[PDB]
């Protein structure tokens, strides 16, 4: 099974600056949607699942 | 490895289930420390008893109060407080006196580091308001040093042992007040009837004062 | 001291209560 | 000679707005939900006000508008309550569109 | 000091 | 035999001097009154233990006394600063969701780590259990909102002081500062008021990060020769 | 208070009733004690 | 080895108490710069208590001298139909201009209230404000 690398080095520091939600991956992911939807604000089916 | 464990009390607790009836558990009350005044308690639950003992003992560390103690023997002051319906009453004693104290507290002031105390348990003998009574009391103590930063004074030590030289034994770090302390003729302080009848001869007990083991 | 400062007196935007219909009618 | 605080506060024009029940305020929007319109108008609070039915569209994100204040922070008291409940907004009547 | 049976083994797990 | 001296001239030195980093120049009164610091809750939403921090009331609303903000606001970012310089972890907590997407681009900015989402229980209590046994928790955390939305302390108020955490927080007149290490009454409501704390801990943490390599090279270059 | 118990710690809590809360909602939840109230209110 | 007693003291004393009695092996990263760079309060929990009888906060009603100018103009003249711009930290309001006016007629000597309101309003109008009275 694919196993999670390590979240942080040798001195200790978490990578991500998301590592303490847990959840870091998702959240980021959402952090990179909210910040597109923005943006475009600023700016301004059958086939697939 | 500094540190001991000692049980203050393992009940059976009978729980009623919707299903399974009444079901037994254990309920255990520890207390750690070290001996030089770290000491902490914890409740332990499991339906095994040393599963029990492993919850408290190893909770317990992680909920140390640091305990301080005057020459590392005794409290600073006499210390009176009540804790729910628990009354605990303890007094400052000089060294050889030995811990005269509930047998609780006994094994309490051991893994703290207190040699040399009386106290006396009043009201509700409850082991859980006891513990925590006790810890509370121990760890809202002011030592000299606090109170000679508090009022900016001089605290100056009397022993009967050692005549009518004064012992320094805390001087305020910031600056000295020259104002004398008012000497307020007659304190308004309240007093503990069965501290004021053993003064005055009035108590009577054929219980108090009794020969026992060295604790 | 200072002029800015605020200074201690009774609500001068304060609204007067409210009155009945009969407020003052025998 | 640094201006204290107590001077800013004096000299401020919140301050010296007085009480801002009834007041005409300027606003900015800042935020647009659908129809909501989220507007600051210079005070703690923001105020939410729905877009007008006459000319909605020239309602967009930086246009000012004009406002009836209310109150700068809705909050009150319930029943059983050590404290105020605040609805974290401010009370306005959005009236129209400020142009030069 | 005084003895309490050992816990668990650490290899009962993921 | 030159640990000591590594430690004596980095580390114990910049804690030799009232303000190694100058965080006094990144603020004043005025430009806190600019952002509307000031402006606190209604009266009838104060907290008792944040009356010390309140100037008074304007008509029912609460004005926060920016004099005492600028001396406690100097104390947090300097204590920031240093945690920053001793390249501590600094987590930022905020419940607050108009403004959880500015917080986690200023974490990522400055390098350092936000928490701006639903805070599951123990995730400070019971670290090791949820990221492993070898997990490093935070050195600081700075709290922009001190409250959840439910309207009560974050719960990492009081799980920091069970873990021995120094928390910087932005107290309002509606907040708790009693575990709260170096509270700094402000408001945390308006968008500029929230901007301006931003920008404050971010450049104080960055300048401390290239004080911390300025300095250490400098030590490296002149230990050779 | 009354009888009728007002003690709620969400007690400042945004009433929200609306058709997209029910869908965002956490299975396992069931209507707490005064959960109910609201709704007994807004029906009258 | 530590202490989750929030309720006991401060993280410092706390800290500070564990690291003398051994308990500690080495002081956290912040214990030193606590140390040097402590806040003005010790943050030691304590419980908010309602407050009784005749207990008050002292918070103090913020009041000026001009507001009583204020509530008078607003009285009579209402609010102008001129625009708050609160953004502006210069903006003057027709209020504050009449504000003005007001405290400079009143250093001129004069010093009835009735008189020096009166006056103020006529000087407004040669300079070419809109004064509309409410009633
Ligand atoms: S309000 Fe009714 S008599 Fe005055
Ligand atoms: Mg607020």
Same mark, same amino acid.
């Given at each position: 099974?694919?196993?999670?690398?390590?979240?942080?080095?040798?001195?200790?520091?978490?990578?991500?600056?998301?590592?303490?939600?847990?959840?870091?991956?998702?959240?980021?992911?959402?952090?990179?949607?909210? *910040?597109?939807?923005?943006?475009?604000?600023?700016?301004?089916?059958?086939?697939?699942? | 490895?500094?540190? $001991?464990?000692?049980?203050?009390?393992?009940?059976?607790?009978?729980?009623?289930?919707?299903?399974?009836?009444?079901?037994?558990?254990?309920?255990?009350?520890?207390?750690?420390?070290?001996?030089?005044?770290?000491?902490?308690?914890?409740?332990?639950?499991?339906?095994?008893?040393?599963?029990?003992?492993?919850?408290?003992?190893?909770?317990?560390?992680?909920?140390?109060?640091?305990?301080?103690?005057?020459?590392?023997?005794?409290?600073?002051?006499?210390?009176?407080?009540?804790?729910?319906?628990?009354?605990?009453?303890?007094?400052?004693?000089?060294?050889?006196?030995?811990?005269?104290?509930?047998?609780?507290?006994?094994?309490?002031?051991?893994?703290? *580091?207190?040699?040399?105390?009386?106290?006396?348990?009043? *009201?509700?003998?409850?082991?859980?308001?006891?513990?925590?009574?006790?810890?509370?009391?121990?760890?809202?103590?002011?030592?000299?040093?606090?109170?000679?930063?508090?009022?900016?004074?001089?605290?100056?030590?009397?022993?009967?042992?050692?005549?009518?030289?004064?012992?320094?034994?805390?001087?305020?770090?910031?600056?000295?007040?020259?104002?004398?302390?008012?000497?307020?003729?007659?304190?308004?302080?309240?007093?503990?009837?069965?501290?004021?009848?053993?003064?005055? !001869?009035?108590?009577?007990?054929?219980?108090?004062?009794?020969?026992?083991?060295?604790? | 001291?200072?002029? $800015?400062?605020?200074?201690?007196?009774?609500?001068?935007?304060?609204?007067?209560?409210?009155?009945?219909?009969?407020?003052?009618?025998? | 000679?640094?201006?204290?605080?107590?001077?800013?506060?004096?000299?401020?024009?919140?301050?010296?707005?007085?009480?801002?029940?009834?007041?005409?305020?300027?606003?900015?929007?800042?935020?647009?939900?659908?129809?909501?319109?989220?507007?600051?108008?210079?005070?703690?609070?923001?105020?939410?006000?729905?877009?007008?039915?006459?000319?909605?569209?020239?309602?967009?994100?930086?246009?000012?508008?004009?406002?009836?204040?209310?109150?700068?922070?809705?909050?009150?008291?319930?029943?059983?309550?050590?404290?105020?409940?605040?609805?974290?907004?401010?009370?306005?009547?959005?009236?129209?569109?400020?142009?030069? | 000091?005084?003895?309490?049976?050992?816990?668990?083994?650490?290899?009962?797990?993921? | 035999?030159?640990?000591?001296?590594?430690?004596?001239?980095?580390?114990?030195?910049?804690?030799?001097?009232?303000?190694?980093?100058?965080?006094?120049?990144?603020?004043?009164?005025?430009?806190?009154?600019?952002?509307?610091?000031?402006?606190?809750?209604?009266?009838?939403?104060?907290?008792?233990?944040?009356?010390?921090?309140?100037?008074?009331?304007?008509?029912?609303?609460?004005?926060? $006394?920016?004099?005492?903000?600028?001396?406690?606001?100097?104390?947090?970012?300097?204590?920031?600063?240093?945690?920053?310089?001793?390249?501590?972890?600094?987590?930022?907590?905020?419940?607050?969701?108009?403004?959880?997407?500015?917080?986690?681009?200023?974490?990522?900015?400055?390098?350092?780590?936000?928490?701006?989402?639903?805070?599951?229980?123990?995730?400070?209590?019971?670290?090791?259990?949820?990221?492993?046994?070898?997990?490093?928790?935070?050195?600081?955390?700075?709290?922009?909102?001190?409250?959840?939305?439910?309207?009560?302390?974050?719960?990492?108020?009081?799980?920091?002081?069970?873990?021995?955490?120094?928390?910087?927080?932005?107290?309002?007149?509606?907040?708790?500062?009693?575990?709260?290490?170096?509270?700094?009454?402000?408001?945390?409501?308006?968008?500029?008021?929230?901007?301006?704390?931003?920008?404050?801990?971010?450049?104080?943490?960055?300048?401390?990060?290239?004080?911390?390599?300025?300095?250490?090279?400098?030590?490296?270059?002149? !230990?050779?020769? | 208070?009354?009888?009728?118990?007002?003690?709620?710690?969400?007690?400042?809590?945004?009433?929200?009733?609306?058709?997209?809360?029910?869908?965002?909602?956490?299975?396992?939840?069931?209507?707490?004690?005064?959960?109910?109230?609201?709704?007994?209110?807004?029906?009258? | 080895?530590?202490?989750?007693?929030?309720?006991?003291?401060?993280?410092?004393?706390?800290?500070?108490?564990?690291?003398?009695?051994?308990?500690?092996?080495?002081?956290?990263?912040?214990? $030193?710069?606590?140390?040097?760079?402590?806040?003005?309060?010790?943050?030691?929990?304590?419980?908010?208590?309602?407050?009784?009888?005749?207990?008050?906060?002292?918070?103090?009603?913020?009041?000026?001298?001009?507001?009583?100018?204020?509530?008078?103009?607003?009285?009579?003249?209402?609010?102008?139909?001129?625009?708050?711009?609160?953004?502006?930290?210069?903006?003057?309001?027709?209020?504050?201009?009449?504000?003005?006016?007001?405290?400079?007629?009143?250093?001129? *000597?004069?010093?009835?209230?009735?008189?020096?309101?009166?006056?103020?309003?006529?000087?407004?109008?040669?300079?070419?404000?809109?004064?509309?009275?409410?009633?």
């Amino acid at each position: 099974p694919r196993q999670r690398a390590i979240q942080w080095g040798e001195d200790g520091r978490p990578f991500h600056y998301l590592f303490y939600t847990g959840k870091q991956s998702y959240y980021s992911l959402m952090h990179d949607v909210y *910040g597109m939807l923005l943006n475009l604000e600023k700016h301004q089916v059958i086939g697939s699942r | 490895e500094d540190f $001991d464990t000692r049980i203050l009390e393992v009940r059976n607790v009978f729980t009623m289930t919707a299903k399974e009836g009444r079901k037994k558990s254990i309920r255990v009350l520890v207390a750690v420390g070290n001996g030089k005044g770290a000491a902490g308690f914890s409740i332990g639950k499991a339906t095994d008893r040393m599963d029990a003992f492993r919850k408290a003992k190893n909770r317990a560390v992680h909920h140390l109060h640091y305990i301080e103690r005057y020459e590392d023997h005794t409290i600073f002051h006499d210390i009176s407080l009540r804790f729910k319906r628990t009354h605990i009453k303890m007094k400052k004693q000089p060294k050889g006196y030995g811990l005269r104290c509930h047998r609780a507290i006994i094994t309490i002031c051991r893994l703290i *580091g207190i040699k040399d105390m009386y106290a006396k348990v009043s *009201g509700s003998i409850n082991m859980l308001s006891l513990t925590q009574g006790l810890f509370r009391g121990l760890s809202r103590q002011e030592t000299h040093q606090q109170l000679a930063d508090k009022k900016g004074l001089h605290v100056v030590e009397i022993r009967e042992e050692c005549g009518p030289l004064p012992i320094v034994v805390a001087s305020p770090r910031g600056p000295l007040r020259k104002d004398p302390e008012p000497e307020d003729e007659v304190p308004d302080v309240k007093l503990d009837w069965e501290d004021v009848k053993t003064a005055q !001869g009035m108590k009577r007990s054929v219980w108090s004062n009794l020969k026992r083991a060295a604790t | 001291s200072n002029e $800015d400062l605020p200074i201690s007196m009774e609500n001068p935007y304060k609204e007067p209560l409210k009155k009945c219909i009969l407020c003052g009618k025998h | 000679n640094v201006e204290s605080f107590a001077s800013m506060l004096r000299h401020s024009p919140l301050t010296q707005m007085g009480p801002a029940k009834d007041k005409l305020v300027i606003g900015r929007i800042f935020h647009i939900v659908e129809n909501d319109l989220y507007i600051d108008f210079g005070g703690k609070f923001h105020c939410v006000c729905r877009r007008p039915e006459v000319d909605g569209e020239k309602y967009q994100k930086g246009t000012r508008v004009r406002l009836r204040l209310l109150d700068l922070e809705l909050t009150s008291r319930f029943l059983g309550a050590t404290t105020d409940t605040t609805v974290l907004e401010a009370n306005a009547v959005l009236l129209g569109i400020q142009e030069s | 000091a005084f003895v309490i049976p050992k816990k668990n083994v650490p290899t009962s797990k993921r | 035999e030159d640990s000591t001296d590594f430690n004596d001239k980095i580390l114990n030195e910049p804690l030799k001097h009232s303000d190694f980093f100058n965080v006094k120049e990144l603020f004043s009164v005025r430009s806190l009154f600019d952002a509307r610091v000031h402006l606190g809750h209604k009266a009838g939403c104060r907290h008792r233990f944040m009356e010390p921090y309140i100037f008074g009331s304007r008509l029912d609303h609460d004005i926060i $006394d920016l004099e005492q903000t600028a001396t406690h606001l100097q104390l947090a970012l300097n204590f920031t600063a240093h945690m920053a310089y001793r390249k501590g972890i600094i987590l930022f907590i905020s419940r607050n969701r108009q403004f959880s997407y500015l917080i986690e681009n200023m974490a990522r900015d400055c390098g350092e780590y936000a928490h701006t989402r639903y805070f599951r229980g123990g995730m400070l209590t019971n670290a090791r259990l949820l990221f492993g046994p070898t997990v490093r928790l935070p050195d600081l955390i700075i709290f922009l909102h001190t409250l959840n939305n439910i309207f009560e302390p974050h719960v990492a108020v009081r799980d920091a002081a069970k873990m021995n955490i120094p928390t910087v927080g932005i107290v309002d007149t509606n907040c708790n500062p009693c575990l709260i290490t170096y509270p700094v009454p402000g408001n945390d409501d308006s968008p500029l008021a929230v901007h301006l704390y931003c920008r404050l801990f971010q450049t104080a943490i960055t300048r401390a990060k290239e004080k911390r390599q300025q300095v250490e090279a400098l030590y490296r270059l002149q !230990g050779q020769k | 208070k009354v009888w009728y118990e007002s003690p709620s710690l969400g007690s400042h809590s945004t009433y929200k009733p609306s058709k997209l809360e029910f869908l965002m909602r956490s299975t396992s939840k069931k209507t707490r004690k005064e959960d109910h109230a609201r709704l007994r209110a807004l029906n009258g | 080895a530590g202490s989750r007693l929030e309720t006991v003291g401060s993280i410092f004393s706390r800290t500070r108490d564990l690291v003398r009695a051994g308990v500690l092996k080495e002081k956290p990263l912040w214990f $030193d710069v606590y140390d040097a760079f402590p806040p003005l309060r010790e943050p030691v929990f304590q419980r908010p208590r309602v407050r009784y009888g005749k207990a008050k906060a002292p918070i103090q009603d913020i009041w000026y001298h001009e507001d009583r100018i204020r509530a008078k103009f607003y009285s009579v003249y209402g609010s102008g139909q001129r625009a708050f711009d609160l953004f502006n930290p210069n903006f003057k309001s027709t209020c504050q201009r009449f504000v003005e006016k007001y405290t400079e007629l009143q250093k001129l *000597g004069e010093t009835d209230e009735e008189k020096l309101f009166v006056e103020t309003g006529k000087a407004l109008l040669a300079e070419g404000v809109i004064l509309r009275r409410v009633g």
